[PDB]
Amino acid sequence: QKRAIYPGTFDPITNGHIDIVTRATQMFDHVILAIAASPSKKPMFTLEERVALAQQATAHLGNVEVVGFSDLMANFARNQHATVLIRGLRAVADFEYEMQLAHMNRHLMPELESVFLMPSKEWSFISSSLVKEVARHQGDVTHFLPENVHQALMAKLAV
Amino acid sequence: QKRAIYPGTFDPITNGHIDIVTRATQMFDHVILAIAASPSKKPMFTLEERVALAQQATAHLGNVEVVGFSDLMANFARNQHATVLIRGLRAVADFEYEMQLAHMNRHLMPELESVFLMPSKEWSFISSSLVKEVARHQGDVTHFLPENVHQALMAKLAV
Amino acid sequence: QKRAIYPGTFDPITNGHIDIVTRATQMFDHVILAIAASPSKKPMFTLEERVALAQQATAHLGNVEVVGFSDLMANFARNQHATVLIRGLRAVADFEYEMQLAHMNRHLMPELESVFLMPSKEWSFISSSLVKEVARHQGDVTHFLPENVHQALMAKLAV
Amino acid sequence: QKRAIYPGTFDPITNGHIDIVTRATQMFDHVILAIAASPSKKPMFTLEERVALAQQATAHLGNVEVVGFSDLMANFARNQHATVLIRGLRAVADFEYEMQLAHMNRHLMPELESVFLMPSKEWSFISSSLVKEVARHQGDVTHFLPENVHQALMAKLAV
Amino acid sequence: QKRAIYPGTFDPITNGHIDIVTRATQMFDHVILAIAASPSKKPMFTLEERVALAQQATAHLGNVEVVGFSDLMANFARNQHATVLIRGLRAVADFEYEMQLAHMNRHLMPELESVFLMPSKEWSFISSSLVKEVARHQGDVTHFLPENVHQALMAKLAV
Amino acid sequence: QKRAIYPGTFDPITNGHIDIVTRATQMFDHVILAIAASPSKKPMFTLEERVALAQQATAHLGNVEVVGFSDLMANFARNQHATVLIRGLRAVADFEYEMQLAHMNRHLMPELESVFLMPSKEWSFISSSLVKEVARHQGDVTHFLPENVHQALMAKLAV
Numbered sequence: 028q029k030r031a032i033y034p035g036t037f038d039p040i041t042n043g044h045i046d047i048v049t050r051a052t053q054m055f056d057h058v059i060l061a062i063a064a065s066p067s068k069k070p071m072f073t074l075e076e077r078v079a080l081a082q083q084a085t086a087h088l089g090n091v092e093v094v095g096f097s098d099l100m101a102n103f104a105r106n107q108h109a110t111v112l113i114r115g116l117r118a119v120a121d122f123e124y125e126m127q128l129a130h131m132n133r134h135l136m137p138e139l140e141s142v143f144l145m146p147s148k149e150w151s152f153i154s155s156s157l158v159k160e161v162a163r164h165q166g167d168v169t170h171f172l173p174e175n176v177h178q179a180l181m182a183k184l185a186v
Numbered sequence: 187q188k189r190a191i192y193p194g195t196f197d198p199i200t201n202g203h204i205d206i207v208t209r210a211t212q213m214f215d216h217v218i219l220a221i222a223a224s225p226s227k228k229p230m231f232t233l234e235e236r237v238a239l240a241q242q243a244t245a246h247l248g249n250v251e252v253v254g255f256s257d258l259m260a261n262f263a264r265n266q267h268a269t270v271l272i273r274g275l276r277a278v279a280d281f282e283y284e285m286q287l288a289h290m291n292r293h294l295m296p297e298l299e300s301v302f303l304m305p306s307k308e309w310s311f312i313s314s315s316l317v318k319e320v321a322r323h324q325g326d327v328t329h330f331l332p333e334n335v336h337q338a339l340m341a342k343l344a345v
Numbered sequence: 346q347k348r349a350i351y352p353g354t355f356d357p358i359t360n361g362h363i364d365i366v367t368r369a370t371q372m373f374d375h376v377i378l379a380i381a382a383s384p385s386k387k388p389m390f391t392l393e394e395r396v397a398l399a400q401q402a403t404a405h406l407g408n409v410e411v412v413g414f415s416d417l418m419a420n421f422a423r424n425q426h427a428t429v430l431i432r433g434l435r436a437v438a439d440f441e442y443e444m445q446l447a448h449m450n451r452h453l454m455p456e457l458e459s460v461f462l463m464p465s466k467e468w469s470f471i472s473s474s475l476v477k478e479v480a481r482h483q484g485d486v487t488h489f490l491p492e493n494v495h496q497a498l499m500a501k502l503a504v
Numbered sequence: 505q506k507r508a509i510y511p512g513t514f515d516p517i518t519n520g521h522i523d524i525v526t527r528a529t530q531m532f533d534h535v536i537l538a539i540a541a542s543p544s545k546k547p548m549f550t551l552e553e554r555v556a557l558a559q560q561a562t563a564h565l566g567n568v569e570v571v572g573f574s575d576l577m578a579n580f581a582r583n584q585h586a587t588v589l590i591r592g593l594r595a596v597a598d599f600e601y602e603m604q605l606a607h608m609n610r611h612l613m614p615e616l617e618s619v620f621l622m623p624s625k626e627w628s629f630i631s632s633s634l635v636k637e638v639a640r641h642q643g644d645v646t647h648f649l650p651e652n653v654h655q656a657l658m659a660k661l662a663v
Numbered sequence: 664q665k666r667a668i669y670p671g672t673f674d675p676i677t678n679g680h681i682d683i684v685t686r687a688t689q690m691f692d693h694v695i696l697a698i699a700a701s702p703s704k705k706p707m708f709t710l711e712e713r714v715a716l717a718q719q720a721t722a723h724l725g726n727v728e729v730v731g732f733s734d735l736m737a738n739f740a741r742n743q744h745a746t747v748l749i750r751g752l753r754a755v756a757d758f759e760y761e762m763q764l765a766h767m768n769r770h771l772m773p774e775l776e777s778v779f780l781m782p783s784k785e786w787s788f789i790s791s792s793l794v795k796e797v798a799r800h801q802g803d804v805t806h807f808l809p810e811n812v813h814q815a816l817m818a819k820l821a822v
Numbered sequence: 823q824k825r826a827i828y829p830g831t832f833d834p835i836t837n838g839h840i841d842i843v844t845r846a847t848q849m850f851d852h853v854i855l856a857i858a859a860s861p862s863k864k865p866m867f868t869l870e871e872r873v874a875l876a877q878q879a880t881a882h883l884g885n886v887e888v889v890g891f892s893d894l895m896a897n898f899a900r901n902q903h904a905t906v907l908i909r910g911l912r913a914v915a916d917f918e919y920e921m922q923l924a925h926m927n928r929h930l931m932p933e934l935e936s937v938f939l940m941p942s943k944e945w946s947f948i949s950s951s952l953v954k955e956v957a958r959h960q961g962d963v964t965h966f967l968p969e970n971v972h973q974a975l976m977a978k979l980a981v
């Protein structure tokens with residue numbers, strides 16, 4: 028069984044993230060979608076909310092397991108028996124941070140291979156930050172989010 | 187009459203911004219310089235201050251109208267009857283965010299065309315953030331700002 | 346009454362070029378789609394072929410005029426009384442050359458303003474170069490080309 | 505039971521290529537190291553030489569198969585029943601072309617997924633092109649090549 | 664005597680910074696390692712702590728002088744009689760800000776030459792921010808920091 | 823007593839090259855402006871012409887020595903007892919190649935340190951390649967070249 032971890036903040040999980048995790052399940056036997064607590068990022072949704080949103084948004088994928096973590100991601104990968112670490116690669120500015128993170132993860136866990144997947148052109152220009160910014164200004168974001176996530180984001184912004 | 191909107195935070199408006207809006211007035215019949223409230227950016231100047239500074243700095247341009255907005259920029263463009271959205275293109279890191287914003291604006295208002303203009307080499311390495319940083323350290327920023335803006339920034343930093 | 350030029354080699358014209366010129370026709374009164382006559386790289390299609398293909402592919406656009414040129418693009422723009430130079434922006438790599446080109450064009454003809462337009466996400470990762478390479482190597486490129494161009498390309502590759 | 509292809513010109517195969525293919529063998533059951541037969545740029549080593557060098561340099565990797573191909577890389581991947589396309593990512597400049605290539609490969613063969621692997625920091629700033637240029641100009645490239653490749657390159661440059 | 668200044672936040676000083684300052688001492692007669700107060704960056708270590716850490720980490724280099732400053736860096740360079748300003752160049756995103764800062768420093772002090780040095784491949788993917796992030800999650804950062812700095816960072820994070 | 827080399831093809835030498843070499847003469851005792859003898863791309867000007875043009879264009883700089891070389895740039899630097907390798911940095915695209923070159927140069931000659939200098943904003947968007955292309959296509963390039971170079975280029979293009 029090949030086990031992969033897909034770590035991130037997922038605040039909230041978007042269609043771009045669903046695209047990446049779907050591609051990951053077609054390649055690896057079991058995919059752990061790992062949601063980092065990320066308090067330094069001051070996330071809009073609590074970790075508990077982000078885990079529930081991602082569980083509902085990925086329920087149609089049989090080999091996905093959603094978990095939350097506050098640990099060092101290399102230790103969390105070791106502890107999940109993962110040998111692959113998935114990250115989505117969108118644009119140039121993303122790539123620079125991704126290489127730093129992957130070279131650091133390789134220093135911490137050399138047998139964990141970081142692999143990058145490319146999203147559909149459809150989701151190549153969106154991010155959780157951009158979708159939240161549009162939603163804060165009451166713009167329509169239905170196209171970019173799973174149904175349950177769109178509902179939660181609308182509810183969150185209605186106080 | 188071709189109507190263009192030039193939206194931004196303009197905290198404060200610099201000579202780089204004047205360069206872009208001047209190029210825009212030579213191309214389009216009416217240019218709306220639209221100042222976003224941008225509270226998430228914690229701006230140095232209030233929206234009212236930024237609007238007054240830009241009005242004074244662009245008074246020599248007959249087809250410029252300065253307005254403030256807190257709305258979604260695509261809705262503000264529709265409501266101003268604008269069919270062109272101008273953004274200045276300075277460097278690579280700017281370009282990435284610009285493509286995300288323009289593809290999002292196109293999703294929200296397909297008939298609004300985002301156009302990018304390139305500033306003079308003179309203003310190609312400055313930004314409102316960089317000018318404020320130098321000014322905070324008492325460095326001379328007279329070369330980068332309209333006279334009224336330089337005065338307001340000096341006064342702001344003198345408590 | 347704005348006159349704009351949209352120069353290039355168009356070897357062959359793709360749906361990405363059709364997207365950019367269509368956007369340009371929505372904002373300027375007259376658009377000259379200018380085909381470079383003697384490119385340094387020996388083109389797949391002769392100038393006669395490139396002009397005929399572009400004419401047929403843009404025939405539905407009332408305010409487009411397809412013209413061949415052999416001079417420096419600024420010299421032709423000046424002779425055509427164009428005040429706007431349309432450039433399509435796809436990704437970071439093109440942007441670097443575009444800055445060099447636009448600053449050089451501003452030195453050569455200051456009265457010509459470069460305007461950067463963004464193509465649909467659909468054509469943001471293609472080029473005439475990539476299309477030709479794929480087609481020469483027996484790949485399906487139908488989706489990226491106007492029908493008349495697809496027919497001419499199949500004919501060229503058959504012989 | 506995943507079948508992966510790792511295509512390229514490998515002119516000659518370097519330690520950077522050995523690093524990427526080794527990583528690919530740790531995560532996929534079968535890896536085809538696919539050597540492009542007729543590259544547009546006349547290669548330093550003939551296809552026969554490139555295949556023999558890659559075979560000897562990967563002989564210790566039980567699940568690697570070295571094969572030459574002359575078709576479009578997607579057509580070969582389809583015929584080989586590969587569902588994974590390995591690409592090595594070194595720096596920003598390659599990433600731009602990689603995005604264009606991967607979106608084109610997804611259009612040609614949607615059932616083939618591109619996976620991006622990161623080489624060691626040791627090989628992150630090299631290429632077959634730079635190695636050849638340095639060696640042709642009497643520079644030491646021993647560190648960047650498998651021993652058999654170093655021996656063949658010295659022989660080629662002597663005559 | 665050629666005098667160079669190497670300014671930065673150094674929160675904390677890493678092996679990447681030691682690499683750059685060592686290269687600088689091999690090139691220039693006297694190197695001032697200048698630690699900016701940087702309150703806007705909300706640094707982990709006080710200026711006094713950062714100066715003591717850097718003094719201890721560079722004690723083996725005879726021509727290095729460590730100082731703290733809150734002044735405009737161009738004025739601090741003039742006041743240190745420096746004619747060279749060193750900055751390390753790691754990646755693309757770093758380069759953009761570096762060109763803005765150097766063109767601003769040139770406007771403020773034209774006789775001060777900004778020079779960029781490239782770190783070892785070993786430190787090309789690390790930063791003070793990344794090392795602090797790993798350390799906050801209890802990951803091993805001994806490889807990236809001088810011994811005294813590693814001890815201080817472990818102590819800082821143990822409350 | 824620092825000896826620095828500033829290598830390149832200088833085909834022809836431009837004001838951008840004059841800017842970089844002038845900056846290098848202000849910080850190092852002796853600067854060798856090193857002209858590559860047999861570039862892979864057949865140069866517009868022969869080596870004799872390139873050396874004569876660079877000599878006349880730098881004659882006012884007392885500590886510059888113009889020399890032709892045909893070996894690998896590191897082999898020449900070693901033979902000249904240079905410990906500093908001057909490289910001009912214009913934009914992001916060049917930076918990527920510069921990193922590869924500098925890490926390769928450090929592998930070949932560790933005692934040679936690469937130093938990156940930044941040209942004036944005035945020359946930050948030009949290259950010998952762009953200048954030649956513009957001039958060949960009947961564009962005005964007088965502003966970008968030393969007078970002697972402008973005279974030689976007009977003569978070369980006339981015949």
Ligand SMILES: c1ccc(Cn2cnc3ncccc32)cc1
Nearest residue numbers: 035036063098099100796797800
């Ligand atoms: C995505 C990105 C970062 C995090 C924070 N973080 C956790 N472990 C880490 N290891 C190295 C660097 C950052 C780390 C979480 C999700």
Ligand SMILES: c1ccc(Cn2cnc3ncccc32)cc1
Nearest residue numbers: 160161164194195222257258259
């Ligand atoms: C410049 C940039 C951003 C803003 C904030 N903002 C407002 N409407 C928006 N629509 C999409 C994304 C951001 C938006 C304002 C000025």
Ligand SMILES: c1ccc(Cn2cnc3ncccc32)cc1
Nearest residue numbers: 352353354381416417418419955
């Ligand atoms: C498309 C491709 C190439 C050309 C050649 N060309 C014409 N004017 C130019 N100015 C600067 C550089 C190249 C130029 C034209 C169109």
Ligand SMILES: c1ccc(Cn2cnc3ncccc32)cc1
Nearest residue numbers: 478511512513540575576577578
């Ligand atoms: C390495 C180098 C070049 C090739 C030529 N080539 C094959 N399929 C392709 N698809 C798109 C573009 C080029 C392609 C193959 C391997």
Ligand SMILES: c1ccc(Cn2cnc3ncccc32)cc1
Nearest residue numbers: 319320323671672699734735736
């Ligand atoms: C590194 C980077 C920035 C600082 C803050 N700072 C101080 N003087 C400055 N001059 C121009 C711009 C920023 C400045 C400090 C260290």
Ligand SMILES: c1ccc(Cn2cnc3ncccc32)cc1
Nearest residue numbers: 637829830831858893894895896
């Ligand atoms: C300018 C342009 C090209 C050269 C050719 N060349 C010489 N040493 C080299 N090392 C690595 C790569 C190319 C090299 C030299 C100067």
